């Protein structure tokens, strides 16, 4: 019948993984005990987005809204526009699409509208340089997120266009058992509807922390000014640690609220990126969910990915248990032979997924 | 209402008592140059003074005498210093046509307002510490959002230099005075001139608003002090 889950925990994946598998799923007891039970608008909006890029899928939400039945269709894609409710930014909706877009009948050219940043979801600049670079490593050669308008909270007004040109049968098998050597650190300091002095001060705060390092530091000042600057003033920084040896990235990102010091947050994110590096072996934590699934959906082949002990956390474990429930795939783990670090190798057999929706 | 503090052009700080009808204390070396601006915290225990020596000096009231606390030296001469009603912000005007905002508790730099072509003469902060107004000699009033330092609107209020602008208490409305001998009543939300007052024969050097906001007092180069009462 239907594999059953509980709660809103990992709502997007259980649908995304369901969509890729073709296996029907039931999500039940969604916030049953809360005063406002059931699905939230942004989650409902995500369901509308899933229907738009697919055909033949049946989505049934209970009368109380606490249970949803999802029978997946085929990924079809196409050109469309999606209005994102204010409760979540665009990155909330762009992220799941990255998981499905490269395996589509037609090209994904989806136009997103709403707030473009938040304290808890992926930013524009994170996706462009923090998640997407992983996709090229997995064989998604061409994928772009064009920034037509930035929208800061609370009024938003931003505009981002998601285009993936690479359509592939399945991602290449993953083989990385080493600790990447970071060559340089880059980033974009952006602000909307404000004075460019704020942008410079943040790079100053970021540079203050990171000047101790022996590698080059170059942070772009992307001040957005004019009609494309959104309807609210806002600002943020994302700093990316880059490895040109085999094309890898580690990144951190935060945005600022009213009354905060641009130098303070610039110091925070620059300090923040180092913690992500410290917890990273081959990938930072915030792209573990993206990389692991691609290994799972590879050919009938064992991929290898080096992970740190700091990365194997509750989020990692719940993610794995979700994968097994739906694919029956188990991520085996063997220790590294080195003693300098306690890094860890994740080995995954692919389920032999293929893009059967594309035309030959 | 029993004491008055005065800042002179010679850099001296003077304190008077009404009951004694005499000067209690004088600080000859309060500043090396004219003490252009002087502001007090809401508690009334800390005094802020701006001078032409490019410094801001903080003073404490201890039983009554003044003691210098800290010196904040700026790159340029200071025209006006204002303390927010909540005592969280400190705004200072410089001859370089930029207004600098500081955090009163920690003296950390917060914002750098820019866009005035001539130096800012007066600064005033809303009762809620959200909106801040800057009036400069360039005949323009600029209303800024203190959350991000954003100029909501720039108003060509008067035909000459605008010396003083004050918020009405418990409201975003404000008054403005200029060398054109006209006092104008404005709406802080709609940004429109509510009323124009033509009584002054010459330049209006100072303006003050009652704590209740019932009346406003303006004095000019004609030696005339007049009281504008809300009817």
């Amino acid at each position: 019948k239907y594999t059953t889950f509980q709660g809103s925990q990992n709502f997007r994946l259980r649908i995304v993984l369901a969509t890729l598998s073709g296996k029907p799923i039931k999500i039940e007891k969604i916030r049953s005990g809360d005063l406002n039970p059931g699905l939230k608008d942004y989650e409902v909006s995500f369901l509308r987005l899933i229907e738009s890029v697919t055909n033949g899928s049946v989505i049934e939400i209970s009368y109380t809204g606490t249970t949803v039945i999802y029978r997946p269709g085929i990924i079809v894609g196409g050109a469309s526009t999606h209005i994102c409710p204010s409760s979540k930014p665009v990155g909330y909706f762009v992220e799941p699409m990255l998981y499905l877009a490269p395996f589509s009948k037609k090209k994904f050219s989806i136009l997103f509208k709403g707030i473009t940043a938040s304290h808890n979801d992926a930013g524009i600049e994170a996706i462009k340089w923090g998640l997407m670079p992983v996709m090229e490593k997995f064989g998604v050669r061409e994928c772009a997120l064009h920034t037509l308008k930035r929208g800061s909270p609370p009024l938003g007004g931003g505009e981002v266009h998601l285009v993936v040109d690479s359509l592939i049968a399945q991602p290449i098998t993953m083989h990385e058992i080493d600790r990447p050597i970071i060559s340089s650190i880059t980033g974009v300091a952006y602000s909307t509807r404000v004075s460019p002095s704020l942008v410079n001060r943040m790079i100053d705060g970021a540079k203050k922390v990171l000047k101790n390092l022996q590698c080059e530091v170059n942070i772009t000042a992307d001040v957005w000014r004019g009609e494309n600057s959104g309807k609210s003033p806002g600002w943020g920084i994302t700093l990316v640690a880059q490895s040109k040896q085999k094309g890898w990235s580690y990144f951190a990102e935060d945005i600022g609220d009213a009354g905060s010091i641009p130098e303070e947050l610039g110091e925070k994110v620059a300090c923040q990126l180092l913690e992500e590096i410290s917890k990273s072996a081959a990938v930072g934590r915030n792209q573990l969910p993206l990389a692991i699934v691609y290994m799972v959906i590879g050919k009938e082949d064992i991929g290898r990915l080096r992970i740190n002990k700091e990365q194997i956390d509750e989020r990692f474990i719940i993610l794995l248990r979700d994968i097994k429930k739906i694919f029956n795939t188990e991520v085996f783990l063997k220790p590294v032979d080195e003693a300098d670090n306690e890094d860890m190798i994740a080995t995954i057999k692919g389920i032999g997924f293929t893009n059967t929706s594309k035309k030959i | 209402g029993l004491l008055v503090i005065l800042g002179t052009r010679n850099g001296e700080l003077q304190l008077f008592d009404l009951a004694s009808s005499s000067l209690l204390d004088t600080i000859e070396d309060a500043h090396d140059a004219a003490i252009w601006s002087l502001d007090l915290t809401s508690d009334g225990k800390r005094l802020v003074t701006g001078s032409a020596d490019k410094t801001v000096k903080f003073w404490d009231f201890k039983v009554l005498k003044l003691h210098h606390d800290t010196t904040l030296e700026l790159t340029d001469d200071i025209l006006c210093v204002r303390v927010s009603p909540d005592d969280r912000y400190l705004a200072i005007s410089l001859l370089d046509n930029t207004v600098k905002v500081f955090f009163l508790d920690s003296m950390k730099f917060y914002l750098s307002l820019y866009g005035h072509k001539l130096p800012v003469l007066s600064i005033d902060i809303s009762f809620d510490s959200k909106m801040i107004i800057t009036s400069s000699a360039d005949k323009n009033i600029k209303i800024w959002g203190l959350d991000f330092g954003d100029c909501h609107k720039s108003l060509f209020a008067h035909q000459d230099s605008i010396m003083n602008v004050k918020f009405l208490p418990q409201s975003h409305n404000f008054f403005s005075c200029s060398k054109d001998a006209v006092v104008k009543y404005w709406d802080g939300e709609k940004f429109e001139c509510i009323q124009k007052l033509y009584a002054h024969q010459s330049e209006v050097w100072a303006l003050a608003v009652a704590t209740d906001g019932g009346f406003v007092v303006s004095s000019s180069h004609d030696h005339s002090i007049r009281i504008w009462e809300e009817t």
């Binding site: 001060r201 992307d222 | 800290t70 010196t71 030296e73």
Partner: peptide
Amino acid sequence: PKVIRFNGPSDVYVPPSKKTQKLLRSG
């Protein structure tokens, strides 16, 4: 008395050219 020197960030702004602006946006 404590003396604190505040050399604030310069407010002078060098605007990027429109063409380099497009190149950076495209990435």
